[PDB]
Design a protein around this ligand. Sequence first.
Ligand SMILES: CCCCCCCCCCCCCCCCCC(=O)OC[C@H](COP(=O)([O-])OCC[N+](C)(C)C)OC(=O)CCCCCCCCCCCCCCCCC
Ligand SMILES: CCCCCCCCCCCCCCCCCC(=O)OC[C@H](COP(=O)([O-])OCC[N+](C)(C)C)OC(=O)CCCCCCCCCCCCCCCCC
Ligand SMILES: CCCCCCCCCCCCCCCCCC(=O)OC[C@H](COP(=O)([O-])OCC[N+](C)(C)C)OC(=O)CCCCCCCCCCCCCCCCC
Ligand SMILES: CCCCCCCCCCCCCCCCCC(=O)OC[C@H](COP(=O)([O-])OCC[N+](C)(C)C)OC(=O)CCCCCCCCCCCCCCCCC
Lengths: 380, 382
Amino acid sequence: AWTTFRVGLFCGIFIVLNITLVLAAVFKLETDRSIWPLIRIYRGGFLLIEFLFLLGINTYGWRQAGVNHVLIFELNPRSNLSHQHLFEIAGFLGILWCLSLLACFFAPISVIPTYVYPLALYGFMVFFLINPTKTFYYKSRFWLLKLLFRVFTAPFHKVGFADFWLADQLNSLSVILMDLEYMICFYSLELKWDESKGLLPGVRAIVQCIPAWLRFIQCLRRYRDTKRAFPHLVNAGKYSTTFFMVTFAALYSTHKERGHSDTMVFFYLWIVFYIISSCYTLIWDLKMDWGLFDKNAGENTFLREEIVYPQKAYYYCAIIEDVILRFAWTIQISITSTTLLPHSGDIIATVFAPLEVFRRFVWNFFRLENEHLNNCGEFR
Amino acid sequence: APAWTTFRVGLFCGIFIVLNITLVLAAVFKLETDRSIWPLIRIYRGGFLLIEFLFLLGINTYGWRQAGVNHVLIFELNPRSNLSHQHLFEIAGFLGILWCLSLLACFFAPISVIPTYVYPLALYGFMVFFLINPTKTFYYKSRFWLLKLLFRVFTAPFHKVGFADFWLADQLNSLSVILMDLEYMICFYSLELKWDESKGLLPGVRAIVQCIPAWLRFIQCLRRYRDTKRAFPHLVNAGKYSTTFFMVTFAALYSTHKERGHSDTMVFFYLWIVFYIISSCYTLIWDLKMDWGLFDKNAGENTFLREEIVYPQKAYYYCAIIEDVILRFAWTIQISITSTTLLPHSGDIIATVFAPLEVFRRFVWNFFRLENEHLNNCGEFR
Ligand SMILES: CCCCCCCCCCCCCCCCCC(=O)OC[C@H](COP(=O)([O-])OCC[N+](C)(C)C)OC(=O)CCCCCCCCCCCCCCCCC
Ligand SMILES: CCCCCCCCCCCCCCCCCC(=O)OC[C@H](COP(=O)([O-])OCC[N+](C)(C)C)OC(=O)CCCCCCCCCCCCCCCCC
Ligand SMILES: CCCCCCCCCCCCCCCCCC(=O)OC[C@H](COP(=O)([O-])OCC[N+](C)(C)C)OC(=O)CCCCCCCCCCCCCCCCC
Ligand SMILES: CCCCCCCCCCCCCCCCCC(=O)OC[C@H](COP(=O)([O-])OCC[N+](C)(C)C)OC(=O)CCCCCCCCCCCCCCCCC
């Protein structure tokens, strides 16, 4: 009863803080002040909060549909997180995010420099996750930290379902890692450390391939430990396509900045590998992840035989939104990896990144359902 | 325990909290030293006190339900659809959200064409319309029951006195200040203001109006004595309530004889202060001995208490006793100050500070009155 009350409290403190944020942005902002670094820094936090909210909705749908998402994840049958707790955590982090944004927008609050407010938020999140005091969701935080350890260094780690799931979720949430690297550079060699104005009126390729690299080496490991080349080397190639696409984007940008003559051939390679990568991940999503387009569909054409969710319109809406937002994700991870689009730049990424988490939230239902009804991942 | 009701209660509580923080941070920053905000607090105090009373009554319902004091057979309520404390929290949060929105609109004046004197009127109109909403929605049963109870309270001599009307008439004593503010509104919209300006403010009969709760309490226990012929509790109860009449009349006469020179102000001051002492002592001893039932014989381990308590800690009872003794004098001094013109130097500060404290004192008193009506028939009902 108190958890539901806290969910309601946070959902509404966050609402009024959002209204205040909109009013301050349309009123308090001093016209030309180069807001872009601020929104780029806070985009990671906003994406994390949205991902937590969408994952709460995911747990809600999983519980209603009758799936054993506490068994596939190998979670304990008791003392796991329901949708209420995820909503509460999301609301608390959103409250902190809004308070930090309002403090940044309101300089006359104190004489303390504004640029400390972002870290005080993000560091808090780390301090929230690094909580050895066994106070707040200690089992959940311990499980998450163990998963992060077994994911971020996972050549020498047998891959269970949770490892693969978080590794896949990293690709769609990689905007946070990109923004982290950008803010590290911004604090290193952009701001002056003297003026109290945080607005300030090829590594990128590696960092963006990092989630792809983790899932690549995790599927290579799965093949090594299983000997089934088809279900795993295919995914290895799927993320190799991401490697090639990011590499060709970087080469194209470098050669265009240098005025290199042969940059058009690099553009052609980039576009062909973009088509290849997008189609590859899309066909894997539809055919293997969700398990749709099964030849034994019958009356459930374009879907599979066994359907758990009530309405079939959800599946078709998801198919269309997937075939659109997967192209969106590929174009976004190609643009933000380099200086591909100087004009749009952060605008298209800021529009698409929130949608990549939505696409992954939608994909979570069907991946969990496909793995539940028939053990698609071979995790047994 | 419905999840959606608790979510809405938390939502309204959070909105109310953030709006109160914004009000505190705005009245300090977005106000002007040339303004006179007193006719604004003197208007919104009724709504704020009503919202606080609803919140405290939700807490009281929580306490009664978790303590075993079934306020469904000793409150004349149907034991099939009873307003839970969560619903009281929800209503209080909704009214508080409306209160904060109207207050913020008055502070900022978002619309230029709308002058800053309709927002309090809009808030109070919305509250009364919610109370008198003809259609069957938004706790229609509870609102109809409350309307009928208010009807039979304000016409107490013509109705048999049950417990519900007795209790509502008791609660009106500490809500009497609200009516006083209403009277001020009646003057403020008829004597002050220019009906076209948009600002706070440019740089009696209410003495009789701080009697209607006391009047209804005095007429009750006399309508009861008419049918029961039990003078022992009822006549002294009526005398206790008439101490209020004497105190208010003498405060008014002292104010009238002090505002102009008549050479007998000291006599009125002496008689008013002795009436103050006797009324405060009368009410205090009635609450401690008759209403709460404390200081009863066979105390045993529970010294100064009854032989059978309900609440887990006797520390609660002792704090209640001390709180009543140090707030029943504040209640009387607030009655003296508001009903007349005693201290123009401070004036409204004392009333606006003591009124929420008096509502809190009622909140405490409700815990033990129903307890002593369940472990007894205190009030002589059954
Ligand atoms: C290196 C840079 C950062 C990279 C990582 C960024 C954070 C990624 C974390 C997101 C995923 C968390 C939820 C996934 C699993 C939940 C699914 C589920 O149902 O599982 C139930 C689990 C727990 O289930 P449980 O509670 O029933 O436990 C199971 C029982 N045992 C343990 C006994 C088996 O849910 C969780 O683990 C969620 C709780 C944590 C949610 C996030 C809180 C902290 C948020 C801040 C993270 C750090 C931000 C850093 C930003 C930058 C800083 C510089
Ligand atoms: C009047 C509403 C007008 C439309 C508003 C639209 C606003 C935008 C869309 C919001 C959609 C909300 C969907 C929530 C999930 C469905 C509700 C649900 O689970 O109810 C059951 C639960 C109750 O659980 P329950 O007990 O019903 O559990 C189900 C079990 N059975 C079926 C057996 C009863 O409702 C709740 O009280 C919890 C969820 C309510 C919504 C919580 C929102 C929290 C937000 C915190 C901040 C988020 C920050 C990031 C947000 C994104 C960026 C802005
Ligand atoms: C950290 C606390 C102190 C700082 C915050 C101050 C908050 C206000 C002062 C304390 C409130 C008293 C305790 C909470 C209310 C009692 C109910 C409770 O705890 O029961 C547990 C209940 C659940 O109890 P339950 O019915 O499940 O019973 C538990 C026992 N079983 C399950 C076995 C039957 O939790 C809630 O859902 C509480 C929700 C309400 C919380 C209070 C805030 C409401 C605000 C509404 C607006 C008020 C407007 C007026 C403003 C103030 C006056 C000017
Ligand atoms: C001049 C204005 C005078 C105003 C005087 C004060 C008015 C407000 C009174 C509040 C107390 C009422 C609740 C008592 C509840 C105690 C018993 C209990 O717990 O039972 C639950 C009770 C009974 O609810 P129930 O649902 O159990 O109903 C009983 C069931 N039946 C009917 C089948 C028998 O709950 C209520 O009575 C709640 C009523 C709804 C909340 C109303 C809030 C106030 C609305 C505005 C008031 C007017 C504002 C001023 C207008 C001025 C205009 C100029």
